[PDB]
Amino acid sequence: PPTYSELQITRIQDYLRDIEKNAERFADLEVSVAKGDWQEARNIMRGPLGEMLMDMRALNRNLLAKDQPTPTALTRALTDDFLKIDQGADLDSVTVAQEGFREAEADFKAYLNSLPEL
C-alpha cells in the first residue's frame, strides 16, 4: 500500500513553503482590485501568485495518486478564478473582480485543506 517517500515529503514541504509565502500577496491583490488598479493587480497575479500556481502544480505532481484529484481540481479552479479577476479588470468593474477574488480565496483555502497527511 503506497506511502510517501522522503523525497516526496521534502519536495512537498519546500513547495508548500513557497506557496504560503507567495500567498501573502493575496492581500495586495485585494487592495489593488478595490482601487481598480488593474496594472498592479495583473502584476501580482502574473508574478508572485503565478509562481504560487506553478508551485501548486509541482506539489500536486509529488502527491500519491490517490491524493491527487482534489488538490489538482482546486488548482484548476484557482487558475480560472484569476481569469475571472482579469475579466473584471477588462470590464473595469471592481464589483465583478472582487467576486473573482472571493472565489480565488475560497478555492485556495480549500486547496490547503485538501493536502494529505504525510
Numbering used by the authors: 34 to 151
What are the paper's exact sentences on this?
The PsbQ-like protein, termed CyanoQ, found in the cyanobacterium Synechocystis sp. PCC 6803 is thought to bind to the lumenal surface of photosystem II (PSII), helping to shield the Mn4CaO5 oxygen-evolving cluster. Here, we show that CyanoQ (encoded by tll2057) is indeed expressed in the thermophilic cyanobacterium Thermosynechococcus elongatus and provide evidence in support of its assignment as a lipoprotein. Using an immunochemical approach, we show that CyanoQ co-purifies with PSII and is actually present in highly pure PSII samples used to generate PSII crystals. We have also determined the crystal structure of CyanoQ from T. elongatus to a resolution of 1.6 Å.
To gain insights into the structure of CyanoQ from T. elongatus, a cleavable N-terminal His6-tagged derivative lacking the predicted lipidated Cys24 residue was over-expressed in E. coli and the protein purified by immobilised nickel-affinity chromatography to near homogeneity. The predicted product contains residues 25–152 of CyanoQ plus 5 additional residues (GSELE) at the N-terminus. The first nine N-terminal residues as well as the last C-terminal residue of CyanoQ could not be detected in the electron density map so only residues 34–151 were fitted. Topologically the protein belongs to four-helix bundle superfamily and its fold is classified as mainly alpha up-down bundle (CATH 1.20.120.290) with four α-helices, of which the first two are broken, and one 310 helix. The first amino-acid residue of helix 2a, Trp71, is absolutely conserved in the analysed CyanoQ sequences. The indole nitrogen is exposed towards the solvent, and in this structure a 2.8 Å hydrogen bond is created between Trp71Nε1 and Asp125Oδ1. The other absolutely conserved residues are found right after the C-terminus of helix 2a and consist of a Gly80Pro81 motif that is immediately preceded by a positively charged amino acid, either arginine as in T. elongatus or in most cases histidine. Both glycine and proline are well known as the most efficient ‘helix breakers’ and in fact they separate helix 2a from helix 2b in CyanoQ. In the case of T. elongatus the larger H2-H3 cavity is composed of a cluster of Met78, Arg79, Leu82, Phe115 and Asp119 surrounding the Gly80Pro81 motif. Despite the fact that five out of the six corresponding positions are occupied by potential metal ligands in T. elongatus CyanoQ, no zinc cations are present in the crystal structure. Although there were no bound Zn2+ ions in our structure, we were able to fit a sulphate ion into the electron density.
